[PDB]
Design a protein around this nucleic acid. Structure first.
Lengths: 66, 57, 189, 140, 72, 139, 139, 58, 101
RNA sequence: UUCUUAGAGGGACAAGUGGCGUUCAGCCACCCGAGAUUGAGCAAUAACAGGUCUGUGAUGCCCUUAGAUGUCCGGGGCUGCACGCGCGCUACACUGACUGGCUCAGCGUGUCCUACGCCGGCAGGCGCGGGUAACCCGUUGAACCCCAUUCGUGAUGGGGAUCGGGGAUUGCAAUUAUUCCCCAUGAACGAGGAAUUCCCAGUAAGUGCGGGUCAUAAGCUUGCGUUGAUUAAGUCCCUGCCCUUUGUA
């Protein structure tokens, strides 16, 4: 199994509420903008954040995320 | 005759290590922090980083 | 068309029981020239079901310490065995193999519920895969064991074993062991 | 293949009982002082067909095999094959057969035990004489 | 038990081979040596000699297993 | 006029050079039928029997094999031949013909086009192999 | 037709038969007695082994050039079984390899290289390629 | 009376070392006939068992 | 002026890549014929020793690696220019060896 | 620059689709893919009266300190065998031995690694070259394996222990035989009782090769390829582990 750690969660959240208008549904666009947005330590970490940002950006349209 | 790259890089390692051990046992009292060795075929320089240089001179 | 060792057809072969009809691979879309595939069929669960039954036989053939990774020789043992089979009985060896595995598979086994030392067993049903597994295992152990210290070779011993097993002869080691396992299940119930 | 007319079932050579059933090259290994190597070269040097079974050899052939086995030096068998190369006493090259090898062994053992050499004492006590550990292993 | 197999053919076994072998479902050095109480070498030689005459067919030749059969 | 591709199994590598000609098939200057592990001869004949000789008619392939072991080389060369043909029937023929080849090759065995990625696993201290450990004696 | 085009097993037997028929191959005095390595237990069974070894040596030297006594000793090496000790790779006899190469030099089939090794002569290449011709013709 | 039975759902895994598995089987001779049985070895949906004794329970 | 070659050998990759790149772009801007970095097989020195001084434990082993990265850059330039381009480029943690013919 | 070396940068995130999930964290299946869990290293708080003063010029006390417990030189011992245990290696054969032929590695080491030529059956002896190493050994012609030959269920051409002779290499020195070679000798062992170890895929196991010891040198360990499986996708029954309730003299 694979659970997203507090690090990627916290990072992903603050990215959403700062640059909601910049992000969309596509993973690769979010992956590319996450490079420009944040100084991030490694590619894997950026991929995981980009992925969970994609996941949140799906359910934001469904309803208001807490 | 010249030694292999492998033995040469090892030899430089032991040189560094032994020099450090000597410098520690000598300049422990004057707070010897560390050493930096730069090597040039003209002349190789050894740079000592210590707390109170006025004393080690 | 595709034929095993380029000389045995896979269309004239026929399955008897529906239970094992999707757990014995040898058919149109699983037709291979040689047993030797070197596939990833033991990677996850229910993948070896899709392994050709001839490959399962030759894989379970290279068992004891001295022949652990000696596949290239089990393939020629199975090749010779298939030729011996065809010479003795006349018809397609793949049918004889399938008939042997159909007969040899135990239908009701016994499971251990209790303590160690004492014997107390509950009689339970056997899954179609486990039936195929034990059938192949029993056939190979019968072949192996029968020809260990006597003159007849592994090839004709495996053939003799599959001839006996396919027509349900009491002489087959696999039939004796199946009979005994079902008799022990019958003793418990 | 063909039926043998006079198959000599048991051969009586060098006070030994040779079984004709086994193939000649390995048949004569039953003689002490003759192995699977020396037997081969002896037969090849006498130019006998090794394929033949020991039972179907003629009188002259087995008599040639005996006489070439006794005196190898005459029939150009090399020096480095001989069982006895430099004999302690007379210092000559010879191949010693069953009775001879037993006699030579007990004589060599007696010679070592006479002078009180370590090997002799280790032999007389019934121990190992090649300097193995005799603690953990070599029981009875 | 001890198996005292015959190194060379006797007349009672040799005539039995030339008549009866020639027609078995499967031909090999093993079964012939077992059935007729023959040695492994002589039984292996016998099949080669029968192939030279041309009574028996060679199905497949190999180091380990040489398989022979009756014709027609 | 020509293409050149590699087939790989474990540490074995077989590079096939595919040009136009009279259906010539050579590996290290030797025909397929004269390859040493003859028991698996059919494994080399797999790609040519599956597609049919008619597709090989206007193609000469020259395979060179290095590294690995015998059977690994057999899987490298038999992979290389098929990859070479589909590469050639991609570059100098319609994509439709390449698809018509690819689907048949994949449908039979995926190994012919896609390389088996697994390698010999690294050995650790405390045992003879990568997983197995030495016998642990209590008293 | 070339050596590479034919079966390499039958080729050696054919070339050995040719080397026997020539009847001008200097066999040593110790062919009947000597083994063929450190690790063989018995002498070779076949009486005409020198001709088969000579044939093999010529074929090896045809396939690649610049092969010395050491290389030929490395070719005919095998597994030394050391009784209770485990088995290790042992090399061939140097003398047999040297006498074979000396004997083949005698036929003017092989000559010494300026680089240091031994290469097959055009006379040799002719003979070897001819033998391949009739070995191919016999199917 | 040796009769066959389809497997619709795997209920759970039972036995002292979880060596067995409990399954509900629908018979072949009758369409709507469900019974609970314990079976050795790996099973999934669709697998058909050959029940020798068809009266016993799990 | 004929065939001077320059052998750059180091344990660090970054410093070696940086210094060699500087030598190349330094040579390129002067309009000199340069044959690019020939990367040889990386030499890995392995030492595997017991962790413990005494020898009582579960028989654990250390695995000490030492990496040696070697680059060759080749020039068809005069010795006077080669001397100054080799002189200017110095870095602690790279060894440079220059050879002519 | 496809293959080879190796720098930079791409690539995989449960991302896409369908179920199940207080439609949350997430789980199972499937498409596209080289890959949908590669193998390690590093590893907290708090403790063992754990082992090491025989690693140290790390070290406190104490014991000896000139017929020494210092240091060196000759020997001998560490290996001494009615017995009991612990890692292992070779086997008990015919899926196998033996003889010949054919054809493939990878890690990594060489101021001692070795090509080539000559003489000796062999261990090895001479002569002359290359390499401080992607340069020479080396295209590292490795073994199982593959294809022929002989053997035939016989303690047998399985097995090679123990013993007798010789012939070489180290070294100042080889006996209590350092290794190495040749001929001869031919023991137990026919798959092992109670018991008990290790292991889930390039894994187990078979099989060789290199490193460390190394003047001489692997039945050891530490690595590397090569051939390559059966069974499982579960459970807390045994042996232990983590959290939560209780009970305790």
């Amino acid at each position: 199994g694979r659970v997203r750690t507090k690090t990627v969660k916290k990072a992903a959240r603050v990215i959403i509420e700062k640059y909601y208008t910049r992000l969309g549904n596509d993973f690769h666009t979010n992956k590319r903008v996450c490079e420009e947005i944040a100084i991030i330590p490694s590619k894997k970490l950026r991929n995981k954040i980009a992925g969970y940002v994609t996941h949140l950006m799906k359910r934001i349209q469904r309803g208001p995320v807490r | 005759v010249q030694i292999s790259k492998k033995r040469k890089f090892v030899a430089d390692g032991i040189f560094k290590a032994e020099l450090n051990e000597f410098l520690t046992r000598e300049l422990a009292e004057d707070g010897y922090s560390g050493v930096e060795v730069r090597v040039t075929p003209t002349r190789t320089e050894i740079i000592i980083l210590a707390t109170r240089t006025q004393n080690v001179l | 068309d595709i034929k095993l060792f380029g000389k045995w057809s896979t269309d004239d072969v026929q399955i008897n029981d529906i239970s094992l009809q999707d757990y014995i691979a040898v058919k149109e879309k699983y037709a291979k020239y040689l047993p030797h595939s070197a596939g990833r069929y033991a990677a996850k669960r229910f993948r070896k079901a899709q392994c050709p039954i001839v490959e399962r036989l030759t894989n379970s053939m290279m068992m004891h310490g001295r022949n652990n990774g000696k596949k290239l020789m089990t393939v020629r043992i199975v090749k010779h065995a298939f030729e011996i089979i065809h010479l003795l009985t006349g018809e397609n060896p793949l049918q004889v193999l399938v008939n042997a595995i159909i007969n040899s598979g135990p239908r009701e086994d016994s499971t251990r519920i209790g303590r160690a030392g004492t014997v107390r067993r509950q009689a339970v049903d056997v899954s179609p895969l486990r039936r195929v597994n034990q059938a192949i295992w029993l056939l190979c152990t019968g072949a192996r064991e029968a020809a260990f210290r006597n003159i007849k070779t592994i090839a004709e011993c495996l053939a003799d074993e599959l001839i006996n097993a396919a027509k349900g002869s009491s002489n087959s080691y696999a039939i004796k062991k199946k009979d005994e396992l079902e008799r022990v299940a019958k003793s418990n119930r | 293949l063909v039926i043998p007319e006079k198959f000599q079932h048991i051969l009586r050579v060098l006070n030994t009982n040779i079984d004709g059933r086994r193939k000649i090259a390995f048949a004569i290994t039953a003689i002490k002082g003759v192995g699977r190597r020396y037997a081969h070269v002896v037969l090849r040097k006498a130019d006998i067909d090794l394929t033949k079974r020991a039972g179907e050899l003629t009188e002259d052939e087995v008599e040639r095999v005996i006489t070439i086995m006794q005196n190898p030096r005459q029939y150009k068998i090399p020096d480095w094959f001989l069982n006895r190369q430099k004999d302690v006493k007379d210092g000559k090259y010879s191949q010693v057969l069953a009775n001879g090898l037993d006699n030579k062994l007990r004589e060599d053992l007696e010679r070592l035990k006479k002078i009180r050499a370590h090997r002799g004492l280790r032999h007389f006590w019934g121990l190992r004489v090649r300097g193995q550990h005799t603690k953990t292993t070599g029981r009875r | 038990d001890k198996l005292n197999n015959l190194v060379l053919f006797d007349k009672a076994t040799y005539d039995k081979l030339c008549k009866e072998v020639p027609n078995y479902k499967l031909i090999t050095p093993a079964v012939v040596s077992e059935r007729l109480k023959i040695r492994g070498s002589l039984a292996r030689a016998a099949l080669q000699e029968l192939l030279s005459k041309g009574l028996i067919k060679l199905v497949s030749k190999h180091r380990a297993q040489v398989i022979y059969t009756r014709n027609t | 006029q020509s293409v050149q591709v590699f087939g790989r199994k474990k540490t074995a590598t077989a590079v096939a050079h595919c040009k136009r000609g009279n259906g010539l098939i050579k590996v290290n200057g030797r025909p397929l039928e004269m390859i040493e592990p003859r028991t698996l001869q059919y494994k080399l004949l797999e790609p040519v029997l599956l597609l049919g000789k008619e597709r090989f008619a206007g193609v000469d392939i020259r395979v060179r094999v290095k590294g690995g072991g015998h059977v690994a080389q057999i899987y490298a060369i038999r992979q290389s031949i098929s990859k070479a043909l589909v590469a050639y029937y991609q570059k100098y023929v319609d994509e439709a013909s390449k698809k018509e080849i690819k689907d048949i090759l994949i449908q039979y065995d995926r190994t012919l086009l896609v390389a088996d990625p697994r390698r010999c696993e690294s050995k650790k201290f405390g045992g003879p192999g990568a997983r197995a450990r030495y016998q642990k004696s209590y008293r | 037709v070339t050596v590479k085009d034919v079966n390499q097993q039958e080729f050696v037997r054919a070339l050995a038969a040719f080397l026997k028929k020539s009847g001008k191959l200097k066999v040593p005095e110790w062919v009947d007695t000597v083994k063929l390595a450190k690790h063989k237990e018995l002498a070779p069974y076949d009486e005409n082994w020198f001709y088969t070894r000579a044939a093999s040596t010529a074929r090896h030297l045809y396939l690649r050039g610049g092969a010395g006594v050491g290389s030929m000793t490395k070719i005919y090496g095998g597994r030394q079984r050391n009784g209770v000790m485990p088995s290790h790779f042992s090399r061939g006899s140097k003398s047999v390899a040297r006498r074979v190469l000396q004997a083949l030099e005698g036929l003017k089939m092989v000559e010494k290289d300026q680089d240091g090794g031994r290469k097959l002569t055009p006379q040799g290449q002719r003979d070897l390629d001819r033998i391949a011709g009739q070995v191919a013709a016999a199917n | 009376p040796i009769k066959l039975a389809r497997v619709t759902k795997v209920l759970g895994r039972t036995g002292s070392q979880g060596q067995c598995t409990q399954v509900r089987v629908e018979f072949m001779d009758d369409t709507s006939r469900s019974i609970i049985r314990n079976v050795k070895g790996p099973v999934r949906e669709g697998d058909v068992l050959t029940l020798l004794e068809s009266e016993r329970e799990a | 002026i004929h065939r001077i070659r320059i052998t750059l050998t180091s344990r660090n990759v970054k410093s070696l890549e940086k210094v060699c790149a500087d030598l190349i772009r330094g040579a390129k801007e002067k309009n000199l014929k340069v044959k690019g970095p020939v990367r040889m097989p990386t030499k890995t020195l392995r030492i595997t020793t017991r962790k413990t001084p005494c020898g009582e434990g579960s028989k654990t082993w250390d695995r000490f690696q030492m990496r040696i990265h070697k680059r060759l850059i080749d020039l068809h330039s005069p010795s006077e220019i080669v001397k100054q381009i080799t002189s200017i480029s110095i870095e602690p943690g790279v060894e440079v060896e220059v050879t002519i013919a």
